[PDB]
């Protein structure tokens, strides 16, 4: 029973790598009932953490797994073969690196900012009615710093990178951009699955081409114009 964190991590490891909860193989990791108590306890446990807790586990697992592969602490074949023992030992050996108490706040606002550099983070009729009742409509009066120029310039790098990769000895549009920024954008596009990379050739993933091909139905507008 004490291995409940090992069960949560086994669900995260399976559903992140194989896209589904591989219950058949999870059963062979931590000894329990044939599916039932594992499935019941998992289902009961997730509702106590919600989508916010699930994302905390997924984001931490993704971060541990890239650091582990970057430092070669696992061989890629063990990931493909789904060696749950090794994969769970990766989070195990990583969790040994830090410890902390439940957080607290100081009464002065500025003091919290000095102490901590906190990081910010189609269907049936009844499903539409459910979704439409949960939403709140609110007019934003204020928020954190707008940071418009950096955000705009960062998106201008996205525009210029996409404009290269969509079809085709110099680049002009990036000349005025800081050489440090390009690294962040190509990295973000990799995380967001928008690109692939041969030994020195970037390529766009089929998502950018497909979204333009599906949503940009200009051949239909041509027929409508004639009609």
């Amino acid at each position: 029973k004490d291995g409940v964190q090992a069960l949560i991590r086994a669900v995260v490891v399976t559903k992140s790598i194989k896209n589904e909860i591989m219950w058949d193989k999870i059963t062979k990791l931590f000894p329990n009932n044939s599916l039932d108590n594992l499935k019941k306890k998992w289902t009961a446990r997730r509702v106590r953490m919600g989508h916010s807790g699930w994302r905390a586990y997924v984001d931490k697992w993704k971060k541990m797994l890239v650091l582990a592969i970057k430092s070669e602490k696992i061989s890629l074949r063990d990931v493909e073969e789904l060696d749950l023992i090794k994969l769970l030992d990766i989070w195990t050996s990583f969790d040994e690196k830090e410890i902390k108490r439940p957080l607290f706040l100081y009464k002065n606002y500025e003091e919290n900012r000095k102490k901590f550099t906190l990081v910010r983070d189609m269907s049936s009729m009844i499903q539409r009615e459910i979704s439409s009742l949960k939403k709140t409509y609110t007019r934003k009066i204020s928020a954190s710093t707008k940071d418009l120029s950096k955000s705009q310039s960062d998106d201008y790098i996205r525009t210029v990178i996409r404009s290269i990769l969509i079809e085709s000895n110099e680049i002009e549009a990036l000349k005025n951009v800081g050489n440090e920024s390009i690294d962040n954008v190509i990295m973000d596009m990799a995380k967001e699955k928008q690109i692939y990379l041969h030994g020195s050739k970037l390529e766009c993933t089929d998502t950018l081409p497909d979204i333009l091909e599906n949503r940009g139905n200009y051949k239909d507008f041509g027929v409508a114009f004639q009609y």
């Binding site: 190509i186 990379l197 390529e203």
Partner: protein, 66 residues
């Protein structure tokens, strides 16, 4: 869906961006940038920077021979 392949591309990008490439090199290599020799009476061309560096190093070797 190609999750381990995506992790492979992602970590490999992060390796290559640490192996001295400015990122703008990976862009330029798709755009059409061939490198070319600059030495007296040399004009040869390369589709990767490592092959250009080897060729310029062969010119350093030529200067050492001379």
């Amino acid at each position: 869906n190609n999750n381990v392949e995506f992790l492979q591309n992602e970590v490999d990008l992060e390796k290559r961006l640490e192996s001295g490439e400015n990122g703008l090199n990976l862009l330029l290599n798709t755009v059409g940038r061939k490198y070319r020799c600059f030495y007296n009476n040399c004009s040869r061309t390369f589709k990767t920077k490592e092959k250009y560096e080897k060729h310029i190093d062969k010119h350093k070797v030529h200067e050492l021979k001379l």
